[PDB]
Amino acid sequence: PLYVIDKPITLHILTQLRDKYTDQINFRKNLVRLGRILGYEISNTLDYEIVEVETPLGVKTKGVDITDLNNIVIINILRAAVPLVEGLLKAFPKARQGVIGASRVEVDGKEVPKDMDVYIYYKKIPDIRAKVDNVIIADPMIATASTMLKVLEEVVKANPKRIYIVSIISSEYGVNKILSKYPFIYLFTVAIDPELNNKGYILPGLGDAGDRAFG
Amino acid sequence: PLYVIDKPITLHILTQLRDKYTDQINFRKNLVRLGRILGYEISNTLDYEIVEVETPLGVKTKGVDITDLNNIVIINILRAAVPLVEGLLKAFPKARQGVIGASRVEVDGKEVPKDMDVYIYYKKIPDIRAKVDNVIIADPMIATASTMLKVLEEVVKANPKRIYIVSIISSEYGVNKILSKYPFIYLFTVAIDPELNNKGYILPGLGDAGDRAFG
Amino acid sequence: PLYVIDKPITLHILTQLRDKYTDQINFRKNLVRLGRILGYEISNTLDYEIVEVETPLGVKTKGVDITDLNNIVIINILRAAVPLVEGLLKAFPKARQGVIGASRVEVDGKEVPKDMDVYIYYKKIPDIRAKVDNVIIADPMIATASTMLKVLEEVVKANPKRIYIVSIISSEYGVNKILSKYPFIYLFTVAIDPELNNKGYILPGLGDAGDRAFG
Amino acid sequence: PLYVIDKPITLHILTQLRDKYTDQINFRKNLVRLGRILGYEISNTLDYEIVEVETPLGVKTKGVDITDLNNIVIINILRAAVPLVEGLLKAFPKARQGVIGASRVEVDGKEVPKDMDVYIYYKKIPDIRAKVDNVIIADPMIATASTMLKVLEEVVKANPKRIYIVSIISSEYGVNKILSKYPFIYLFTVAIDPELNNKGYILPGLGDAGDRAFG
Ligand SMILES: O=c1ccn([C@@H]2O[C@H](COP(=O)(O)O)[C@@H](O)[C@H]2O)c(=O)[nH]1
Ligand SMILES: O=c1ccn([C@@H]2O[C@H](COP(=O)(O)O)[C@@H](O)[C@H]2O)c(=O)[nH]1
């Protein structure tokens, strides 16, 4: 499933991120806001049960109980994903966190990359309950989707109940590459951009998340 | 405009609020959450506009710029409305705040009328820029709407650009009264409950907002 | 006892609060900050006990457990105290909040006020456990000490283990008045201004708190 | 300069971290917390000046202005430091963040050398202004100081007006290895532990910050 959250407020933030005149302080600020928001959207796609509670006025009433909110694991890719994950964690107060330090080897070429090398420098993940936990992986950008598929190689084994991928911008090439391999993955993103340049950068994109966040 | 925000997450928190076994800490904690979510939703009804921004990759693209995020005044009626206004202020960083104290007229009798006058003992409100500001009045529960009415008479004279009313549970009698008298108002709420018992409590409701929050 | 918290950072904030040019968004922004830092300072004055915990390395070591952090009740006198309490609760996660819509009566100015009338509109407070709970009462200003003494009147009969008063600015008259009656109160403030005018406003002080925060 | 910040509130937080039973969510929560506190203490050593501000009462008064609050760069060396930096960044709203990913050297032999090389694979740091910016480098635990030394050797090259190192626990060894090479570095820690066991673990320490925060 592909959820493109393009509501006025998320598109308003995306425009601040895209704008090159935005400094890293405000850039990181929005990522935290968007992870907050995107987290809410994801909340509304979870499994809920119909329950009954008694109000103060003795009256019994029917309400919902999203049992899944107690089975969430958010994996942080680090780098630009930190402000984002900081936002998601705000929305899922009961989520455990894991980190899979992934970074693609940025190559310069004469053609548009359809694939890139990805190295993993750090790995600390919580136990993932099979058929129970909902895993959320954050990545500000998805270009060739090489970074994402690399982290997935492992997450997918755990066989979590669900798998969500949050990103700000995704390239058409990337969404299709990921969802054609794991179409069961709920992929959230505020927008999808057309192409990748010869360095594997999304166009129009927003630049190098890492550079925008800590430059 | 009536906007009932009955999504899985909001109703989940609402269930939490109704449940009589939810202590005051968690009760307020959830009230803050809803202010955030209810604020997010309010944002998407805001008046935006299309702009053009240049990204780091030299490409220029179109985006959104919700300028009304600068012209916002949130009015806090105190009491249990505090945790709520707190979350709404987090959803509107550039929003100014005003507060008002109010006590409805105490007329001899154990029973309670539905149309009572209200005494506004304290009133501190930022200047409401005519035709430019968007006023948001926060109030946990609208049972009889006597207070909402008293306040609205004041805000109206200011000639806002838009007026919003946020609440968790709002009695059917209340919605009707407010919207029928002021049709142009955006009244957001997580749920509209049926009746009001003689004591004026919303049924099933969630008890006394104030006592749940600071009891 | 009197605790004047004049650490470089607190005085920095205060300078912002006193500055008549500080707008209400920043005014309240600073009050939340100051509430955090003061709750921190306050937390250090609390009673604690030596314990023993087991590190993952299978090694016991002595430690500190501030047991009272689970027995705190913050009393919000509302209005301009709001932002300040918002900050204090951030330092005390497990604290129960109570509210008191108290407000001294504006005087004529024909005589130097000593004992002012205090109206009590609303009052919802948690069960204060005698000899166990530590009560924290917050009000940004303390001039004639009337609003506070009014509040204390009740808090004392509850026989708490400790009573803490927190503010930004206190007057000499007020600190002595409160402390002459209840010498056991732990009174925190960032500054003690020397005089009150005839209207009951601290000089140089910082103006009317409510108007600064909600004007 | 060595600053051991062992106040009741910080030791209380430290005690929880050392306690093996503290779950991951709570472990990271405390890091964020110690981060704002340590941030508060650091803020009192920053350059500041006396200024004249006029209050609403129409009278001028002196105050403090910590101008150095606009010249802070925080360096996130990732890993278990994410929670800590998060807190630090709250204490310094105007701080710019930079990141540098570092990994230890593969060294066959169960035992871990006191001194060892460190590979820095990612480095994105804002423009450190010479003799102006204050560089804060958070790192939960300094055992062998190997990572800190590697990172310092880079940071120092920019001639920062000042360099701070914030850590929860630090071994005597590491403290001596840092200050012995750079005695001008402000090394803030909550507790210094005696020895390091053969696996590079501080004793009593608190185990592996990575597994404690992400496991
Ligand atoms: O325009 C771009 C393209 C890629 N990336 C980085 O590349 C990673 C994903 O690229 P890919 O693996 O999908 O190609 C992310 O961690 C992100 O930091 C950017 O910052 N900006
Ligand atoms: O300079 C002053 C003096 C008093 N007050 C208000 O008066 C109350 C305390 O005054 P008193 O009861 O200590 O005299 C506080 O709620 C505060 O809002 C101010 O705002 N500014």
- 3-state SS record for B107-176: CCCCCCCCCCCEEEEEEECCCCCCCCCEEEEECCEECCCHHHHHHHHHHHHHCCCEEEEEEEEEEHHHHH
Q: Which pair of tokens denotes residue A159? A: 């066989």
Chains touching chain B through at least 3 C-beta pairs below 8 angstroms are A, C
Pick from D32, D27, D30, D34: which is nearest to D7 by CA? D34
Please name which of C184, B158, D9, D24 lies closest in space to residue A126, comparing C-alpha atoms.
Answer: D24
Instruction: Say how far apart CA C103 and CA C106 lie, in whole Å.
Output: 9
Binding site for CTP: residue ranges of D? Answer: 28-29, 36, 86-95
Using CA positions, which residue lies closest to atom 14 of ligand 2? C144
Measured between alpha carbons, how far is A167 from A189 in angstroms, rounded to an integer?
5
Can you give the C-alpha Rg of chain B in angstroms?
A: 18
- Per DSSP, the residues of C4-71 read E---HHHHHHHHHHH-TT--HHHHHHHHHHHHHHHHHHHHHHS--EEEEEEETTTEEEEEEE-GGGGS
Amino acid letter, D201: Y
A207 is in an annotated binding site: yes
- For D194, residues 6+ apart whose C-beta sits below 8 A from its C-beta are D171, D172, D203
Please answer yes or no on whether A64 and B11 come within 8 Å at the CB atom. Answer: yes
CA angle C117, C120, C122 (to 5 degrees): 170
CA A29 – CA D89 distance, rounded (Å): 11
Buried b (16+ CB within 10 A) or exposed e, C136-158: bbbbbbbbbbbbbbbbbeebbee
d(CA A208, CA A212): 6
- In terms of residue numbers, what domain contains A75? 1-215
Half-sphere exposure of residue A42: CA atoms within 13 angstroms, side-chain side:
33
Q: Select from D199, D206, D213, D101 the least CA-distant residue to D147.
A: D101
Query: What contacts A180, CB < 8 A, 6 or more positions away?
Result: none
CB of D16 closer than 8 Å to CB of D211: no
> A212: annotated binding-site residue?
no
B31 assigned binding-site residue: yes
D206 in Cβ contact with C63 (< 8 Å): no
The helix or strand, by DSSP H or E, that contains position A29, with its residue range, turns out to be helix A24-43
Strand partners, C99: C76, C124
Element (DSSP H or E) covering residue B56: none
> By what method was this entry solved?
X-ray
Return the DSSP state at D68: G
3-state secondary structure of C140: coil
Q: Is D207 left (phi over 0), alpha (psi -120 to 50) or beta?
A: left
Give the count of alpha carbons within 13 A of A80, CB side only: 24
Q: Which two tokens stand for residue D93?
A: 């709203």
CB burial string C174-202: b at 16+ within 10 A, e below: bbebbbeebeebbbbbbbbbeebeeebbb
Token pair recorded at residue D98: 């930079």
CA quadruple B151, B154, B158, B159: dihedral, nearest 10: 70
Q: Rounded CA gap, B153 and B146, in Å?
A: 11
In sequence order, the 6+-apart residues with CB closer than 8 A to the CB of A52 are A60, A61, A62, A63
**Quick one: which H or E segment has residue D126?**
none
Return d(Cα A201, Cα A189) in angstroms, integer: 16
Structure tokens given for A93: 């107060």
Pocket test residue of A118, A147, A176, A178 for ligand 1, highest count of atoms within 8 A of CB: A147
Single out the residue of B191, B194, B209 nearest to residue B140, CA to CA. B209
Distance from the C25 Cα atom to the nearest Cα atom in chain B, whole angstroms:
6
Give dist(CA D183, CA D2) in Å, integer.
9
Q: Report the candidate in D35, D87, D37 with the shortest Cα–Cα distance to residue A86.
A: D87
Is the bond preceding D126 in cis, omega lying within 30 degrees of 0? Answer: no
Å from CA of B104 to ligand 2 middle: 26
CB distance A212 to A22 below 8 Å: yes
- CATH number for the domain including D87? 3.40.50.2020
Contact in structure between D57 and C201 (CB atoms under 8 Å): yes
d(CA B138, CA C193): 36
CA nearest to C106, candidates C117, C96, C121, C120: C117
C-alpha closest to that of B182 among B135, B140, B141: B135
Residue D149 phi/psi, 5-degree rounding, is -60, -50
- Is residue A63 within 8 Å of residue A53, measured between CB atoms? yes
> What are the helix (H) ranges across D134-185?
146-155, 172-179
* Ligand 2 site, CB within 6 A: C 80, 104, 116, 139, 141-148, 174, 200-202, 205, 208-210
Domain count, chain D: 1
Rounded to 10 degrees, the C-alpha dihedral B99/B138/B87/D69 comes to: -30
Taking the CA of residue B107 as centre, how many other CA atoms within 13 Å lie in the half-sphere pointing to its CB? 11
The residue to which tokens 């909402």 are assigned? B148
